[PDB]
Amino acid sequence: ETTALVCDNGSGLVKAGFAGDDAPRAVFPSIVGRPRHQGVMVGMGQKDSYVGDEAQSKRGILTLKYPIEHGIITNWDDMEKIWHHTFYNELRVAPEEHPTLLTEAPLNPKANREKMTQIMFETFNVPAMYVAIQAVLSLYASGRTTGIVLDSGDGVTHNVPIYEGYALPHAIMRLDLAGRDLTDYLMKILTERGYSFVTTAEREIVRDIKEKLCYVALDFENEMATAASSSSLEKSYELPDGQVITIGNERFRCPETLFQPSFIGMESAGIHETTYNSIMKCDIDIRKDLYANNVMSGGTTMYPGIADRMQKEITALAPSTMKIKIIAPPERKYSVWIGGSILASLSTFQQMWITKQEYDEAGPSIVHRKCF
Amino acid sequence: ETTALVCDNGSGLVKAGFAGDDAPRAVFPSIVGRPRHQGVMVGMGQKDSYVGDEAQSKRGILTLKYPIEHGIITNWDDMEKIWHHTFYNELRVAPEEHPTLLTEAPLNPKANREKMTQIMFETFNVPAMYVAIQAVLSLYASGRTTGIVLDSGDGVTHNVPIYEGYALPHAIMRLDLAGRDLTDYLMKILTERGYSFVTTAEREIVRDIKEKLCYVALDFENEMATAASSSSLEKSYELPDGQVITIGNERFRCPETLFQPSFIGMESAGIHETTYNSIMKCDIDIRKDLYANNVMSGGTTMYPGIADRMQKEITALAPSTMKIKIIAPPERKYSVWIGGSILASLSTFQQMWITKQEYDEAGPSIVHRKCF
Amino acid sequence: ETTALVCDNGSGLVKAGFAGDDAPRAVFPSIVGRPRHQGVMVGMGQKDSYVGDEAQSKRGILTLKYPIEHGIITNWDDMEKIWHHTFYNELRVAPEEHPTLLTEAPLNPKANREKMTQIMFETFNVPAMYVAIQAVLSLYASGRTTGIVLDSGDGVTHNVPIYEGYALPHAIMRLDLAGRDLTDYLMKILTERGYSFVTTAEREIVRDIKEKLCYVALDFENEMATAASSSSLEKSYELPDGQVITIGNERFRCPETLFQPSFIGMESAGIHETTYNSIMKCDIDIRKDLYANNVMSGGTTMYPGIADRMQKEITALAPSTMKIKIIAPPERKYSVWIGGSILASLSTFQQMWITKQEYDEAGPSIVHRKCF
Numbered sequence A, B, C: 001e002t003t004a005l006v007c008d009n010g011s012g013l014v015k016a017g018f019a020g021d022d023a024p025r026a027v028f029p030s031i032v033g034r035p036r037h038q039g040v041m042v043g044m045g046q047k048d049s050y051v052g053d054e055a056q057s058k059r060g061i062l063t064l065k066y067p068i069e070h071g072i073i074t075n076w077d078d079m080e081k082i083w084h085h086t087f088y089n090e091l092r093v094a095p096e097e098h099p100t101l102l103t104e105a106p107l108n109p110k111a112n113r114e115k116m117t118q119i120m121f122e123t124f125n126v127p128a129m130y131v132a133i134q135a136v137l138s139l140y141a142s143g144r145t146t147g148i149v150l151d152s153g154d155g156v157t158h159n160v161p162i163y164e165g166y167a168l169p170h171a172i173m174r175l176d177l178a179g180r181d182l183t184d185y186l187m188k189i190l191t192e193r194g195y196s197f198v199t200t201a202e203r204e205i206v207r208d209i210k211e212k213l214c215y216v217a218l219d220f221e222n223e224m225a226t227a228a229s230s231s232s233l234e235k236s237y238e239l240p241d242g243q244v245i246t247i248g249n250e251r252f253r254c255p256e257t258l259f260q261p262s263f264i265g266m267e268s269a270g271i272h273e274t275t276y277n278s279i280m281k282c283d284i285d286i287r288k289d290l291y292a293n294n295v296m297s298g299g300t301t302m303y304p305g306i307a308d309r310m311q312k313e314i315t316a317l318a319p320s321t322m323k324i325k326i327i328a329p330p331e332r333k334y335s336v337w338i339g340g341s342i343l344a345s346l347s348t349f350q351q352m353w354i355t356k357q358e359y360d361e362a363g364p365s366i367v368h369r370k371c372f
């Protein structure tokens, strides 16, 4: 009768909530803020660390640290503070009477999963847990059983193909280019017009400009010629100190790094060629079902016009006799968590939990035996 | 008096030299490098393409491409540059006064042989050339006239049985599993410990780790239990940036792919079962000589302990009443070239060249009538 | 025959002269002074503006303005007067018969470059003009073709890595902390001893104290304990009004802001961590030629003992098994100009000038196409 806690601990945001729902209960950025100046006024609850939204609102006097870098946890006390805040302050539930479902990027280091096991069973100890792959949860949320997943979050962009219920681990591709790299590239190219941003409190502003003002160009050279020709593609955004900024071609030079990674010095191919090479690394007889079931998920797949560009590039790459259909649901931003809300609700899933007792015999190594 | 040129065009390395020698004169990787960044300094011989050791030493600013993949030439301008470099810069000879010996994997497409014919008679035009099968050259280097040759290089792995001078073309097996796939699998399994390698300049480093630290386990499960029990099978390697890495079971998980191709999602059987099925696709009365003269050659047969594992697996597969001998010469890495240094020096061979006037009479198609 | 005019327009000083020389002909501060009081004596050539050393000598009755702050030109009439004084009074040459070389900080706004081009081609119109990056000129002056440059001046501190003639623009780092902020921090800490300095005529005096009495401490806490223990680190300087001042620990507290930017409220990392993070933002293979060729140039890298502190911090940051070399030429204060005297004298450079007819063909937009 105890509900399961689905907790997607992504690189930029945390989506935590109960199983069986439609939307995540607590969505908050995964930052830990610490005071950087000196305190003069005595009293009024001057905490030494702020986690989440109060770190976001008080960000002018705080240095912000992300505990997760490219899907890998680096600072463990900060991630412990993140888990404590999302268990006791957001969901307001006791973790010792609820199973927990966690997500993990493919091709992660093993010690990351082992330390999640050790912390989750020795500090916020649970009756049981499970660790799942995010792309499988995306196919849960889409409702299909076949297709290839382009899941691009804040640190990790990965392609996973699954045909008729079976995963293909030899064609899973991973690229470390995601929305934090696009935020840094927007920070680099915003100095062309004179707008200088340095601090992490300015990184949040640059992230807000990236979410509210950027879109994917359909044709790159035609859009650059249109931007250089007439002044009709410039938008204005108001900073929190009152200055207005006006940006032009930088609206579509930021998400073009997703298709051309050579802008930031990476010699890897674009995500369209990554998807095409991941499809051609599979068996030949299943490629027809993979072309018609392109499913994307994540926060950086919500750009305006990315679906038409993806369709055009894959249609150029694929032979002309085949049907390529791109699936972009309007609720992809939480769809991985939505898969958790499907996965923990199934009665057949309720035997695959890693129990506390099984951990007590098997040590912190059973999670590679059970969870794939 | 004109010394013939033996030039082994392997998938990863090029071994070129004169006839009659004991060692190849020029051994260099078949890598074409191109600039990937922008150049701000003016002068000092900034070329647009680097070939060989110059591309290997300056690999940090270059995109590295292999012109040969799985024994099939894909890029022809790069392969022409490779031939120009190995004729005019390495061997320092004029190709118009020397006959040429070329090597080729079995079951190759014929258009590869026709285009190398047209190139070697129209751009670096020679008095004559011959194209030979590499397993025949390995059997020449062994000095025997019977036996099965397992030649495994950088792109291909082929088994050819030859009894008393007559090869059996219906029992020739080809597998597309070689050291490039072992390098890619070493990249895939090195992310378990957090060491991420993505670039081709890093792929050379992963190749160096594969050559200097990997070995074939005699028993797989006992070695995995020994690695999980104690940390006595862990070695350390120093990266060029000063960082050190430590690897454990990954020393023997990488070359186990040759015996179990299901690790990388290949459905085909291992190399021992391939040799066994190739031997009893021959006739019954010759199998005693084929079991007693099992010869390996190539760079990926230089793994420490691969011969004992091969002996054990063929001993298990064959009936126990007879003698199975695995012949691994210490110099097998260049032995195909050594076979060329035997074959181009024989006086009986000097009537089997494909001359210039024969090519002009019969087009670029006579290489299928003459060369087998 | 007509030599080029190399004019380093820095934030605090202007270094102008002819191409092919070893030292800059005219080195003068980039200030414009204006009268602030009323004049009762009529005659004697009372100008309404003083530029250069004339404003420096008569600075007691003038308000001094810098036209360039943080490498960005703000006042254009003052910068035009600076250019007119360095063309017609210091160099005493006609600008219409000499090509001009200009220097510019990386990650600069492009409107600065286009207004510089429009002014140089329509007011002091030239046959040709090229704009270069200062770190490239520093590597031209040092004579090598590889290494990372920490170029720190009066407005900007930037790190640029260049390997074998190829620059890496994705690893170029810029920090807006330079000698002006050190001068302001020296004013902020000089009120501890009762010496108050407010005006720009006092800014020149505080700058002179910073140049002739400050040095970089090796170990900060040990020199703080030495200054608090015994009176041995106090120096005396004579002000122009005859008063003497005595300073103690403030000799090394001022240049510690370059290593600890948190003293002036900036949360950015130190310049040693900036160099380290720029080097590990490059590729792995080229880091050995970057640790062995660390070059600095500019005025604020001329502190006593900054090279030893640099070597100690990068030695601590790098792995201990690898050599770090710090290169500080004695003539770094003009070395960027020295690179101009190398760059404009090469015969290979003479085909990359922006001509007058090219500018009239292509507008003021060719300068981003040609000059990187």
Ligand SMILES: Nc1ncnc2c1ncn2[C@@H]1O[C@H](COP(=O)(O)OP(=O)(O)O)[C@@H](O)[C@H]1O
Binding pocket: A009, A010, A011, A012, A013, A014, A152, A153, A154, A155, A179, A180, A207, A210, A211, A212, A298, A299, A300, A302, A303, A333, A334
């Ligand atoms: N409308 C939008 N346009 C572009 N990018 C967006 C948009 N909304 C969110 N993002 C990006 O998505 C990233 C986080 O996506 P998400 O996958 O939900 O979180 P996580 O990666 O932590 O799982 C943020 O860094 C943000 O920059």
Ligand SMILES: Nc1ncnc2c1ncn2[C@@H]1O[C@H](COP(=O)(O)OP(=O)(O)O)[C@@H](O)[C@H]1O
Binding pocket: B009, B010, B011, B012, B013, B014, B152, B153, B154, B155, B179, B180, B207, B210, B211, B212, B298, B299, B300, B301, B302, B303, B333, B334
């Ligand atoms: N000591 C070694 N152990 C394992 N593999 C090796 C060793 N030396 C070379 N190799 C592998 O052999 C491959 C090339 O073998 P070789 O046949 O000599 O060249 P090619 O295949 O180009 O003819 C390389 O990819 C390398 O990975």
Ligand SMILES: Nc1ncnc2c1ncn2[C@@H]1O[C@H](COP(=O)(O)OP(=O)(O)O)[C@@H](O)[C@H]1O
Binding pocket: C009, C010, C011, C012, C013, C014, C152, C153, C154, C155, C179, C180, C207, C210, C211, C212, C298, C299, C300, C301, C302, C303, C333
């Ligand atoms: N001996 C010195 N010690 C410390 N700082 C110095 C010294 N000499 C000059 N400087 C500083 O260098 C700055 C100017 O350096 P430079 O790079 O030559 O000029 P710019 O930055 O205008 O190109 C001045 O602001 C001055 O404070």
Ligand SMILES: [Mg+2]
Binding pocket: A010, A011, A152, A153, A154, A298, A336
């Ligand atoms: Mg996510």
Ligand SMILES: [Mg+2]
Binding pocket: B010, B011, B152, B153, B154, B298, B299, B336
């Ligand atoms: Mg070979």
Ligand SMILES: [Mg+2]
Binding pocket: C008, C010, C011, C153, C154, C298, C336
């Ligand atoms: Mg300067």
